[PDB]
Amino acid sequence: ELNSFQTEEITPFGLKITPQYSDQHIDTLPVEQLKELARKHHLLILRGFKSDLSDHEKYEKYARNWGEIMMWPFGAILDVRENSYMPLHWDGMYKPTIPEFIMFHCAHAPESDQGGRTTFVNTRRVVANATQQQLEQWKNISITYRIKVTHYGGEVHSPLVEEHPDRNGFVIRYNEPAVHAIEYHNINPDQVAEFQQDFINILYDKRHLYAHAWKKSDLVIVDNFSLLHGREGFTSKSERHLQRIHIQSNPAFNNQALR
Numbered sequence: 001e002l003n004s005f006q007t008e009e010i011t012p013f014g015l016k017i018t019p020q021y022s023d024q025h026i027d028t029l030p031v032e033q034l035k036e037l038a039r040k041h042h043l044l045i046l047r048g049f050k051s052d053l054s055d056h057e058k059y060e061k062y063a064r065n066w067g068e069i070m071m072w073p074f075g076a077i078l079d080v081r082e083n084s085y086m087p088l089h090w091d092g093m094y095k096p097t098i099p100e101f102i103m104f105h106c107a108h109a110p111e112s113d114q115g116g117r118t119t120f121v122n123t124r125r126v127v128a129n130a131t132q133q134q135l136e137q138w139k140n141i142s143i144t145y146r147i148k149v150t151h152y153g154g155e156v157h158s159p160l161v162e163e164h165p166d167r168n169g170f171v172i173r174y175n176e177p178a179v180h181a182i183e184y185h186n187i188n189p190d191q192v193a194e195f196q197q198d199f200i201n202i203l204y205d206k207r208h209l210y211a212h213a214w215k216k217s218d219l220v221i222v223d224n225f226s227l228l229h230g231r232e233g234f235t236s237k238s239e240r241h242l243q244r245i246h247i248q249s250n251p252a253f254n255n256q257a258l259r
């Protein structure tokens with residue numbers, strides 16, 4: 001009745017999953033149990049397992065065990081390759097569907113790289129830590145985002161607070177500004193600047209944010225319905241190479257914010 005992997009809880013949220021014996025293969029892990037843990041804990045770091053997922057064919061075949069892949073024009077896999085931070089967002093903003101899971105495989109992460117950790121914000125925890133007056137204000141705010149050339153048109157109008165697709169709580173949908181692109185609704189224009197200051201401070205809080213330093217062959221599973229994610233600005237030059245696959249909910253979740 002024991003698990004077939006070791007688990008350690010991450011601060012402030014998430015699970016770090018590691019092998020029980022040397023050279024344990026990633027294919028040994030029970031995918032349906034992992035999906036349940038990812039929905040409950042929002043972030044899984046699978047570290048130390050043997051895999052050949054830098055092979056695009058093998059990675060795609062592996063991800064199909066998790067569900068329907070959300071395909072992009074370039075295919076199933078985005079190869080993320082290498083100063084400013086990348087703003088918090090959720091994936092699928094400008095697409096017709098929002099994927100439930102992001103899978104990141106680390107094909108390359110030199111110790112040579114300094115900083116630039118991937119950021120993960122548990123918006124369920126943000127909602128749970130808010131006062132009632134805060135949450136009431138946030139539920140009344142909606143935001144229009146304008147982006148780059150995209151395949152499906154490029155304007156997003158999203159409430160700041162949404163109910164989770166599983167109807168078991170509320171989440172935050174927010175795209176932080178980068179250093180009009182963003183336009184806030186239902187708030188006095190006189191208060192927008194300070195609200196933006198205050199809300200970004202709330203998201204970049206040690207109670208809510210986990211910053212991940214990559215190691216080669218990490219497989220990270222992200223609950224895109226519950227989290228926002230981004231990246232710290234890089235101090236040094238980096239050769240990091242991540243490989244990203246999106247997995248649809250069943251049925252796929254249509255993106256009502258796309259305009």
Ligand SMILES: [C-]#[N+][C@@H](Cc1ccc(O)cc1)C(=O)O
Binds near residue numbers: 089090092093095175
């Ligand atoms: C569609 N879409 C994107 C969403 C996005 C929006 C803003 C930003 O800075 C980065 C990514 C994805 O899911 O990849």
Ligand SMILES: [Mn+2]
Binds near residue numbers: 089090091229
């Ligand atoms: Mn992203």
